[PDB]
């Protein structure tokens, strides 16, 4: 009962006896009134057959014992309910007194056959062992009714597996490619191990969003379809290392996913209430400082890649003119605020290392127009966060930073084709316009992870519309097809571009297109009801000053050390039993040319290997 | 590939065929009605009813306007594909074992079996067609020519037309192939002696300039039309009923098998009559595709090379759609040579 250390037994004891604790305490009428309530509450398990109401040193009686003609109903009875509640402190607390034949002293404990980091090796390991020559792993929705696995073998993508109905909606990679997150409508699964099976699965239905912390430790699941799974905790956070639901947070209405945003380290997690920013903390998903930050009018918020900072912004809110705020955490201080004044919208673009925050700002004159776009760049390594005001120009529709660097590319509207502007860092300081190119169909700027190559893409156009630029000093290499292009992705090290046409987006061609950085198409493979393509992530495993030095070793001119040896190995792959088969192929092409000739001459017919359109 | 199973026929299959655009599949069996199926999903479009005997052969014209059937009931029928009605019947003094349209649809040949005292023959019929609608205007009750079993050969069992209808190629019950010159009043041109058993199938490449033979003697030969040179030999340990040349890829599909008879089959081993894929040029077995409960009697490939169908002595048709692993299947020297292009 009453003592602040007191509890019922923590497992079942002997089967036959009811122990109920913190009963209605003795006083006027209460003693016989206790029987009067007990023989209604406990009579639904069967009729009371013995009752024992002891007293102890003359102190008021906290517990009673009850027995039944069928005794083994008692083990159900103290499982069937606990906590049923009468007056005052009387909240009936149920147990069976201790076993005396069995004991709880030591067990066999707990096996695990394998865990998550094995298929991190089953990314890197496979990249070493496998013979080819020379690239990335997929990740294809489309060939056939199957979720399917491919390499990039230069000649074709070779298919490794095609698995029938693996996902019931969409399939998502883990950040290093370690797990595959597969949606099943009866619970999200993490498919692990080298040959792919479920190692972990999380029961949440109504889910459509299924995304990781960027450091692979936590999974966040969101149901836009309410069930009674959520009630009403629709944002559910699952810990991958334990395998457990750590939190649910109640549902949402605004805006784009992720609505709940992680820091880079995965230390902090947060969501906006419009009148208050709430900040939640790893490892247990607590509440930082035991507080939430009462700041009003926030229109979006973006975490820095650098430890540990949020950029957020407020438009004109009643008494408050518009501003962009840089806030440091866990201190929670608005370290750099700049009021921007009379803005239709703004977009907050971090550089990839946290070095700079560029803000794209659209300002309003008294005619109520989006008259001019400005670029204003905060510098975060530099003392007291100085600000590069850079640009003034008409209708900027896109902006993108150089990955891992400091250059950027910009698109302007209404000329009447889209104009492209290119920006570099000056040796005297400041970042400034350096080049432009004539107006085009490109609406999307998509840069290589290796910094040099930028794609200018007219996504969701029937034709053309992909243009390719090498950088520094931005020079156009190539322009190519992709009929009804929707989807676009790069190799993590910038060698290959893949672009696709999802059947969710478009239905006049449906395909994936695979292309080498140069201006050489590898292949385009039409696919019958094409759903999706995603490369498996492959981060460079370690990086260091000596690796950065080895990259500079040949000083710039040409080099001839590696590729010529791989081409020599490929040249060896045309030899030894190979020669007889090369001869066969040849003899066949010749036989065919001979008949091809004769038929053109004799009856004017062109031979073929498939029935023409 | 993915396979689904079409059931309609309760009797052993005798022939399956795709149409020119590869969206319909036609089949006949030892039942007296033929079926038409959508090749996309295996849905049954309808049936061809009117024969009273096994239908041995079915063919569909290049327009998909008519199909023709040959029957054990001693008749050939011409059917209108859009309503399934019979528009012409010819009576035969003997069963008809095979029928095929000329490449442009104005003639069909029919193999008349050598039964009772008939020596057998390949009959050629003419369909005069409206040049716009390709509907028929006239059929004659007589064939316009009869190639009677040539002196020294046994009766023909299979026949087809080469490119532009300039030759008829035939296979015979004594393992020979013979060739007839259509311009020159179908005169005998030449023959080769290939198999120790009857020729059980013969099918053409997509351009009709070469063909592939099969026999229950376990061998299959790829043969050039103009020379009758044998180009390739595929050697098996299995009696063959049927064979095809694939479009798109350089593959051959062969099919046959030996009925089990007296030996017990376990549930683990049930459903293992297969089609064998060979590389056309290297003559090497590259795959076996299981699924049938008795010998394969007929195989057909779509002209787009994107699916194939097989019909079994088990009374089922398995319909196969190729997947990405099939389209990308390549020997190392084939990857090399395809890249040498650029």
Swiss-Prot record, chain B:
Gene3D superfamilies: YVTN repeat-like/Quinoprotein amine dehydrogenase. One of its GO terms (biological process) is translation reinitiation. It is found in: Cytoplasm. The modification Phosphoserine is found at residue 302. GO terms for molecular function: RNA binding; translation initiation factor activity. It comes from the Eukaryota. WD repeats lie at residues 8-47, 50-89, 149-190, 194-233, 291-330. GO terms for cellular component: cytoplasmic stress granule; eukaryotic 43S preinitiation complex; eukaryotic 48S preinitiation complex; eukaryotic translation initiation factor 3 complex; eukaryotic translation initiation factor 3 complex, eIF3m; multi-eIF complex. Pfam families: EIF3I. The keyword Repeat applies. Keywords: Cytoplasm, Initiation factor, Phosphoprotein, Protein biosynthesis, Repeat, WD repeat. Its main location: cytoplasm. Disulfide bonds: none annotated. InterPro entries: eIF3i, WD40/YVTN_repeat-like_dom_sf, WD40_repeat_CS, WD40_repeat_dom_sf, WD40_rpt. Component of the eukaryotic translation initiation factor 3 (eIF-3) complex, which is involved in protein synthesis of a specialized repertoire of mRNAs and, together with other initiation factors, stimulates binding of mRNA and methionyl-tRNAi to the 40S ribosome. The eIF-3 complex specifically targets and initiates translation of a subset of mRNAs involved in cell proliferation. Belongs to the eIF-3 subunit I family. The eukaryotic translation initiation factor 3 (eIF-3) core complex is composed of TIF32, PRT1, NIP1, TIF34 and TIF35. The factors eIF-1, eIF-2, eIF-3, TIF5/eIF-5 and methionyl-tRNAi form a multifactor complex (MFC) that may bind to the 40S ribosome. Present with 2400 molecules/cell in log phase SD medium. This is Eukaryotic translation initiation factor 3 subunit I.
């Amino acid at each position: 009962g009453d003592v602040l250390k007191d509890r019922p037994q923590e497992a079942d004891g002997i089967d036959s006896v009811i122990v109920v604790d913190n009963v209605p305490q003795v006083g006027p009428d209460r003693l016989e009134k206790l029987k009067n309530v007990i023989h209604k509450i406990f009579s639904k398990f069967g009729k009371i057959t013995n009752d024992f109401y002891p007293e102890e040193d003359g102190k008021t009686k906290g517990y009673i014992f009850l027995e039944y003609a069928s005794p083994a109903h008692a083990v159900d009875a103290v499982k069937n309910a606990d906590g049923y509640k009468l007056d005052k402190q009387h909240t009936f607390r149920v147990n069976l007194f201790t076993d005396f034949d069995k004991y709880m002293t030591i067990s066999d404990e707990w096996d695990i056959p394998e865990k998550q980091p094995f298929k991190d090796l089953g990314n890197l390991r496979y990249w070493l062992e496998e013979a080819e020559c020379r690239d990335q792993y997929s990740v294809i929705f489309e060939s056939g009714d199957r979720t399917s696995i491919f390499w990039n073998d230069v000649k074709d993508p070779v298919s490794i597996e095609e698995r029938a109905r693996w996902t019931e909606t969409y399939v998502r990679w883990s950040p290093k490619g370690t797990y595959l997150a597969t949606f099943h409508q009866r619970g999200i699964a993490l498919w692990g191990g080298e040959k792919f099976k479920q190692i972990q699965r999380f029961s949440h239905q109504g889910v459509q969003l299924i995304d990781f912390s960027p450091c692979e430790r936590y999974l966040v699941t969101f149901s836009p379809l309410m069930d009674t799974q959520d009630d009403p905790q629709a944002i559910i956070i699952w810990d991958i290392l334990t395998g457990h639901k750590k939190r649910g947070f109640h549902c949402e209405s605004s805006a784009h996913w992720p609505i709940f945003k992680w820091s880079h380290d995965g230390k902090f997690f947060a969501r906006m209430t419009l009148d208050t920013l709430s900040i939640y903390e790893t490892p247990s998903m607590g509440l930082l400082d035991k507080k939430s930050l009462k700041i009003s009018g926030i229109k979006d918020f973006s975490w820095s890649p650098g430890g540990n900072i949020i950029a957020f912004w407020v438009p004109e809110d009643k008494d408050i003119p518009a501003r962009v705020t840089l806030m440091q955490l866990p201190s929670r201080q608005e370290i750099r605020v700049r009021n921007l004044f009379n803005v239709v919208d703004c977009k907050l673009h971090w550089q990839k290392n946290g070095d700079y925050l560029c803000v794209k700002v659209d300002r309003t004159p008294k005619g109520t127009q989006g008259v001019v776009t400005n670029f204003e760049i905060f510098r975060m390594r530099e003392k007291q966060v100085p600000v590069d005001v850079v640009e003034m120009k008409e209708t900027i529709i896109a902006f993108a930073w150089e990955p891992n660097g400091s250059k950027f590319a910009v698109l302007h509207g209404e000329a009447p084709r889209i104009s492209v502007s290119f920006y570099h860092v000056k040796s005297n300081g400041k970042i400034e316009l350096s080049k432009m190119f004539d107006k085009q169909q490109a609406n999307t700027i998509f840069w290589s992870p290796q910094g040099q190559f930028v794609v200018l893409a007219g996504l969701r156009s029937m034709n053309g519309a992909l243009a390719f630029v090498d950088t520094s000093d931005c020079t156009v290499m190539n322009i190519a097809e992709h009929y009804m292009a929707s989807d676009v992705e790069w190799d993590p090290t910038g060698r290959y571009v893949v672009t696709s046409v999802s059947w969710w987006s478009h239905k006049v061609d449906n395909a994936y297109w695979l292309w080498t950085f140069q201006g050489r198409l590898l292949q385009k493979n039409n696919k019958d009801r094409f759903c999706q393509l995603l490369w498996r992530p492959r981060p460079p495993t370690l990086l260091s000053q000596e690796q950065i030095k080895q990259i500079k070793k040949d000083l710039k001119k040409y080099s001839k050390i590696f590729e010529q040896k791989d081409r020599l190995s490929q040249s060896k792959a045309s030899k030894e039993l190979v020669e007889r088969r090369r001869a066969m192929m040849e003899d066949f092409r010749k036989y065919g040319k001979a008949a091809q000739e004769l038929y053109v001459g004799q009856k004017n017919e062109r031979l073929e290997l498939r029935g023409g359109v | 590939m993915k396979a689904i199973k079409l059931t309609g026929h309760e009797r052993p299959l005798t022939q399956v065929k795709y149409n020119k655009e590869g969206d319909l599949l036609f089949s006949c069996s030892k039942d007296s009605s033929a079926s038409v199926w959508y090749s996309l999903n295996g849905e049954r479009l309808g049936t061809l009813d009117g024969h009273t005997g096994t239908i041995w052969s079915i063919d569909v014209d290049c327009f998909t306007k008519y199909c023709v059937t040959g029957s054990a009931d001693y008749s050939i029928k011409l059917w209108d594909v859009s309503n399934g009605q019979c528009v012409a019947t010819w009576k035969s003094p003997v069963p008809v074992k095979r029928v095929e349209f000329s490449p442009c649809g104005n003639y069909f040949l029919a193999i008349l079996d050598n039964v009772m005292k008939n020596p057998g023959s390949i009959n050629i019929y003419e369909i005069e067609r409206d040049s716009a609608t390709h509907e028929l205007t006239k059929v004659s009750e007589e064939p316009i020519h009869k190639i009677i079993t040539h002196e020294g050969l046994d009766a023909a069992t299979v026949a087809g037309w080469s490119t532009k209808g300039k030759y008829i190629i035939a296979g015979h019950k004594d393992g020979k192939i013979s060739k007839y010159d259509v311009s020159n009043n179908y005169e005998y041109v030449d023959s080769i002696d290939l198999h120790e058993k009857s020729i059980s199938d013969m099918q053409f490449s997509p351009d009709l300039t070469y063909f592939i033979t099969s026999s229950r003697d376990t061998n299959s030969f790829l043969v050039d039309v103009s020379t009758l040179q044998v180009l390739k030999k595929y050697e098996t340990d299995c009696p063959l009923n049927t064979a095809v040349i694939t479009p798109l890829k350089e593959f051959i599909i062969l099919g046959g098998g030996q009925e089990a008879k007296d030996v017990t089959t376990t549930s683990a081993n049930e459903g293992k009559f297969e089609a064998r894929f060979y590389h056309k040029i290297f003559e090497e077995e590259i795959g076996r595709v299981q699924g049938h409960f008795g010998p394969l009697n007929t195989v057909a490939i779509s002209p787009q090379g994107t699916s194939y169908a097989s019909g079994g002595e088990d009374g089922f048709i398995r319909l196969h759609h190729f997947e990405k692993s099939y389209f990308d299947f390549k020997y190392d020297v084939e990857k090399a040579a395809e890249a040498k292009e650029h």
